[PDB]
Amino acid sequence: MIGLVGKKVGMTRIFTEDGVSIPVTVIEVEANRVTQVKDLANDGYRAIQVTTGAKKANRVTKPEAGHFAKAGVEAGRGLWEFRLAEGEEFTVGQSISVELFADVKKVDVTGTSKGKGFAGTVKRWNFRTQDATHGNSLSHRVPGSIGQNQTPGKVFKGKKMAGQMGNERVTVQSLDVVRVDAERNLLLVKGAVPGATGSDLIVKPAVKA
Amino acid sequence: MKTFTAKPETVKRDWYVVDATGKTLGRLATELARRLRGKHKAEYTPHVDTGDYIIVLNADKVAVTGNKRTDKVYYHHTGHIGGIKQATFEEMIARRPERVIEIAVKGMLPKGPLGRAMFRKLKVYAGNEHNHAAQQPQVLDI
Amino acid sequence: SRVAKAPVVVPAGVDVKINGQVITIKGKNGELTRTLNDAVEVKHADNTLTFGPRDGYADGWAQAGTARALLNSMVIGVTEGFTKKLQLVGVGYRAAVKGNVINLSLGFSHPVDHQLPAGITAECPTQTEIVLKGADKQVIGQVAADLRAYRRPEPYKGKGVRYADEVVRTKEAKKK
Amino acid sequence: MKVRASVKKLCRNCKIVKRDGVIRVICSAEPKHKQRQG
RNA sequence: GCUGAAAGCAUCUAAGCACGAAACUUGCCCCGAGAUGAGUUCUCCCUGACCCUUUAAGGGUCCUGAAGGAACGUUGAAGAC
RNA sequence: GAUGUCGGCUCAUCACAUCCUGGGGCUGAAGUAGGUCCCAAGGGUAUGGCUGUUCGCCAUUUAAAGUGGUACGCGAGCUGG
RNA sequence: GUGAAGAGGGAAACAACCCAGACCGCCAGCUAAGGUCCCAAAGUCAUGGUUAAGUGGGAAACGAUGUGGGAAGGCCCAGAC
Numbered sequence: 051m052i053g054l055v056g057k058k059v060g061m062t063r064i065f066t067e068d069g070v071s072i073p074v075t076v077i078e079v080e081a082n083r084v085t086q087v088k089d090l091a092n093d094g095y096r097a098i099q100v101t102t103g104a105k106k107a108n109r110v111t112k113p114e115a116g117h118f119a120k121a122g123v124e125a126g127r128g129l130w131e132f133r134l135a136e137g138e139e140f141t142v143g144q145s146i147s148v149e150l151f152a153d154v155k156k157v158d159v160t161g162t163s164k165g166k167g168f169a170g171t172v173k174r175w176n177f178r179t180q181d182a183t184h185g186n187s188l189s190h191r192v193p194g195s196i197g198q199n200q201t202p203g204k205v206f207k208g209k210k211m212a213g214q215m216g217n218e219r220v221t222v223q224s225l226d227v228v229r230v231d232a233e234r235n236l237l238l239v240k241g242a243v244p245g246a247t248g249s250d251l252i253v254k255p256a257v258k259a
Numbered sequence: 260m261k262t263f264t265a266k267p268e269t270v271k272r273d274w275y276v277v278d279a280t281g282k283t284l285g286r287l288a289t290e291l292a293r294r295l296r297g298k299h300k301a302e303y304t305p306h307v308d309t310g311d312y313i314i315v316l317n318a319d320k321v322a323v324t325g326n327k328r329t330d331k332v333y334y335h336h337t338g339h340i341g342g343i344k345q346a347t348f349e350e351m352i353a354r355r356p357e358r359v360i361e362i363a364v365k366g367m368l369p370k371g372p373l374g375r376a377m378f379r380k381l382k383v384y385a386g387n388e389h390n391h392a393a394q395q396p397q398v399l400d401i
Numbered sequence: 402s403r404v405a406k407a408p409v410v411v412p413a414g415v416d417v418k419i420n421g422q423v424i425t426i427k428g429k430n431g432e433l434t435r436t437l438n439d440a441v442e443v444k445h446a447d448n449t450l451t452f453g454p455r456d457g458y459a460d461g462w463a464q465a466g467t468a469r470a471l472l473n474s475m476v477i478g479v480t481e482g483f484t485k486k487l488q489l490v491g492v493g494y495r496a497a498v499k500g501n502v503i504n505l506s507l508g509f510s511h512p513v514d515h516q517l518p519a520g521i522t523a524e525c526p527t528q529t530e531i532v533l534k535g536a537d538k539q540v541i542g543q544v545a546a547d548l549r550a551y552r553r554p555e556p557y558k559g560k561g562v563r564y565a566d567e568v569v570r571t572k573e574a575k576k577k
Numbered sequence: 578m579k580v581r582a583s584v585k586k587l588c589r590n591c592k593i594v595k596r597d598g599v600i601r602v603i604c605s606a607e608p609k610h611k612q613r614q615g
Numbered sequence: 616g617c618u619g620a621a622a623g624c625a626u627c628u629a630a631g632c633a634c635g636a637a638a639c640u641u642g643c644c645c646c647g648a649g650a651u652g653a654g655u656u657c658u659c660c661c662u663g664a665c666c667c668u669u670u671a672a673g674g675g676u677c678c679u680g681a682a683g684g685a686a687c688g689u690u691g692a693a694g695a696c
Numbered sequence: 697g698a699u700g701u702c703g704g705c706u707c708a709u710c711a712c713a714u715c716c717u718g719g720g721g722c723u724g725a726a727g728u729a730g731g732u733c734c735c736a737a738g739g740g741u742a743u744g745g746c747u748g749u750u751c752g753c754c755a756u757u758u759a760a761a762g763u764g765g766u767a768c769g770c771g772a773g774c775u776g777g
Numbered sequence: 778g779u780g781a782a783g784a785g786g787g788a789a790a791c792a793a794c795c796c797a798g799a800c801c802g803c804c805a806g807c808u809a810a811g812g813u814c815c816c817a818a819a820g821u822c823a824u825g826g827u828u829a830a831g832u833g834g835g836a837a838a839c840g841a842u843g844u845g846g847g848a849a850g851g852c853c854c855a856g857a858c
């Protein structure tokens with residue numbers, strides 16, 4: 051099945067009668083508009099393109115506007131693609147809503163994780179710190195050794211080092227869909243999902259289940 | 260007088276089609292490297308690609324002798340420690356058939372830019388169809 | 402060698418068709434086909450089939466003795482049947498057929514429900530007896546092997562699925 | 578089976594066989610006699 | 616293990632056929648066309664005068680200056696720059 | 697006309713003669729649990745007391761607390777017993 | 778004997794091994810060791826065979842109806858295996 055694009059509103063809880071507090075991320079799933087149907091002939095794979103939301107007419111560029119105008123849809127904030135599994139058909143101009151998640155039980159959510167900038171080894175890789183005292187000279191959270199001695203004679207690739215952490219695509223899988231609210235354009239997903247409040251989310255049904 | 264050197268502005272390269280069905284990989288690969296290099300030409304100048312363009316069809320049906328279909332192992336390294344990756348001949352034929360003849364021919368060509376340049380004139384295809392009909396390529400039996 | 406040089410005699414009511422190596426035989430039990438190795442000339446020259454090697458193949462006679470045994474099993478297989486029985490041993494072991502499926506109960510937590518091929522048929526005169534029937538000899542040993550594989554006879558008591566041909570050697574447990 | 582450089586018939590019912598370039602001993606009477614060269 | 620000769624038999628193997636593990640290839644996640652083999656798809660913009668001379672993917676003048684981009688500024692749950 | 701030597705810490709990486717997990721044959725394998733060999737290196741593979749210790753003993757764990765190579769890996773990374 | 782005090786060619790690369798001792802020049806030719814399918818100059822040479830293990834292109838005692846060849850020899854139409 052395809053998935054839908056939404057927005058991170060924030061987190062809340064759903065109390066149940068039985069006494070359980072369920073943490074939920076609220077995903078605003080406005081109606082997704084099909085802007086391009088790629089098919090096996092002209093494109094080489096079967097997917098749909100979607101937009102959602104709104105952008106200024108004054109901030110849409112002419113290349114973007116023709117692409118929206120060809121589809122007969124209003125310019126949304128971005129373009130996202132979803133592959134099709136050989137039975138699901140779609141048409142340009144078709145508006146897909148959060149009701150698609152009505153019968154699904156678990157969803158995978160992907161977003162851009164919160165960015166931590168230049169992160170040290172301790173934070174980025176769970177590197178254990180060295181002794182705070184007991185002689186330590188300027189080497190409290192430094193990474194220690196980064197290799198061997200005159201046999202590789204180099205640092206191997208993929209060595210866990212300090213650098214950019216977060217601000218990257220992250221998918222969290224198999225998240226229970228707590229509630230689908232079609233009239234208010236909301237998906238409720240049990241638990242945290244990646245990224246900051248106000249950030250673009252892609253929600254698909256769970257591959258594994 | 261000084262001996263002739265080909266000039267790559269005036270060098271003429273002809274287009275040839277080859278079928279790879281049933282043909283020994285190594286025996287076939289050698290003739291392509293010969294022709295890709297320009298050794299078959301009297302105007303052979305080894306710092307000049309005097310060679311010819313060749314299309315190879317039916318790379319998926321190149322033949323090998325012995326138990327090499329199952330036991331010839333293509334090794335490559337990724338550049339990541341432990342990243343020694345394997346693929347037999349039949350797994351390659353299954354996944355990227357055009358690579359089996361391209362790897363053999365690249366090994367037989369010179370190493371360096373001109374060798375890298377000679378290799379560009381080889382166009383390998385897994386099937387019996389190519390899209391270079393405009394180049395008017397001649398049949399060539401190896 | 403002796404196997405190849407004895408000709409394959411076909412009895413009445415078996416139409417045979419030599420398209421080179423690919424060779425099929427038709428009978429009351431049904432069509433059976435084979436695609437012999439390149440080193441085997443097979444000929445109609447009688448109401449028989451003859452087997453001998455094709456010059457240019459070192460194996461040669463080895464393939465012709467193979468080919469002979471195969472067609473013989475095929476010729477027998479299309480006219481008369483091949484039948485392998487399998488006896489179940491076990492207090493709580495039993496088998497039943499549902500049509501192209503044998504539902505085995507062999508002391509497992511799950512049920513064993515084995516699916517048959519195109520031309521094999523299984524009956525059960527007893528809870529603990531499976532009886533296959535088929536034109537092919539290779540498929541019916543392959544099926545009887547698979548059924549035997551779920552509960553292959555264990556030595557001590559002889560509990561499991563056994564061919565009724567099978568004689569099982571029983572040992573006694575480590576003393577004390 | 579027992580795996581050794583030297584594989585031998587240990588009884589009359591033993592039998593040598595080569596199966597994938599591997600000398601093996603099968604016995605119909607004694608599974609103790611099963612051997613693989615290696 | 617099945618069928619099965621070589622080797623009348625036997626034989627899991629030579630031909631042929633099937634089972635078979637956290638290893639292998641996939642499947643899951645992420646990067647990814649500098650993949651110079653630089654790929655595809657959709658959309659957008661530009662539809663004028665001429666001089667010159669070794670007349671060749673040539674150079675220069677006038678007019679034109681688009682789509683879009685960058686800069687600048689307000690800035691950010693993006694960020695060492 | 698200098699290649700810093702024990703152990704610890706930090707970070708590790710390979711090999712497989714595999715400690716656990718996985719698959720299997722023989723068993724003097726009833727079962728449970730073992731013994732032995734074959735395949736398998738994907739992942740995983742203690743905290744403490746005593747000692748500078750490596751090791752080892754002891755206490756208590758764990759599915760297991762593997763064996764080795766990497767200048768007895770790692771002092772222009774730390775410690776300096 | 779070579780290197781040391783010896784270049785050149787070959788042995789992938791490799792003072793000391795194999796070939797061979799550089800007065801200079803030549804866009805001439807014959808050979809040495811070693812080689813002649815492509816990288817890479819020259820046989821995809823000819824005749825007869827061997828190998829099926831990529832043996833060739835690393836490794837012993839020992840093991841084995843692998844396969845080729847040879848010398849004989851026992852049993853065998855009073856019927857053998």
Ligand SMILES: [Mg+2]
Nearest residue numbers: 164165166167
């Ligand atoms: Mg940030």
Ligand SMILES: [Mg+2]
Nearest residue numbers: 186187188190
């Ligand atoms: Mg400090």
Ligand SMILES: [Mg+2]
Nearest residue numbers: 201202203204
């Ligand atoms: Mg190096």
Ligand SMILES: [Mg+2]
Nearest residue numbers: 369370816817
């Ligand atoms: Mg070179």
Ligand SMILES: [Mg+2]
Nearest residue numbers: 712714735736
């Ligand atoms: Mg091992």
Ligand SMILES: [Mg+2]
Nearest residue numbers: 637638639738
């Ligand atoms: Mg895996």
Ligand SMILES: [Mg+2]
Nearest residue numbers: 743744745746
């Ligand atoms: Mg201790």
Ligand SMILES: [Mg+2]
Nearest residue numbers: 709764765766
């Ligand atoms: Mg180690």
Ligand SMILES: [Mg+2]
Nearest residue numbers: 199767768769
């Ligand atoms: Mg050390």
Ligand SMILES: [Mg+2]
Nearest residue numbers: 199770771772
């Ligand atoms: Mg150091």
Ligand SMILES: [Mg+2]
Nearest residue numbers: 702748776777
């Ligand atoms: Mg001290």
Ligand SMILES: [Mg+2]
Nearest residue numbers: 780781782792
């Ligand atoms: Mg001296």
Ligand SMILES: [Mg+2]
Nearest residue numbers: 786787789790
């Ligand atoms: Mg040299």
Ligand SMILES: [Mg+2]
Nearest residue numbers: 806807808819
């Ligand atoms: Mg000469």
Ligand SMILES: [Mg+2]
Nearest residue numbers: 810811812813
């Ligand atoms: Mg010679």
Ligand SMILES: [Mg+2]
Nearest residue numbers: 813817818819
């Ligand atoms: Mg040459």
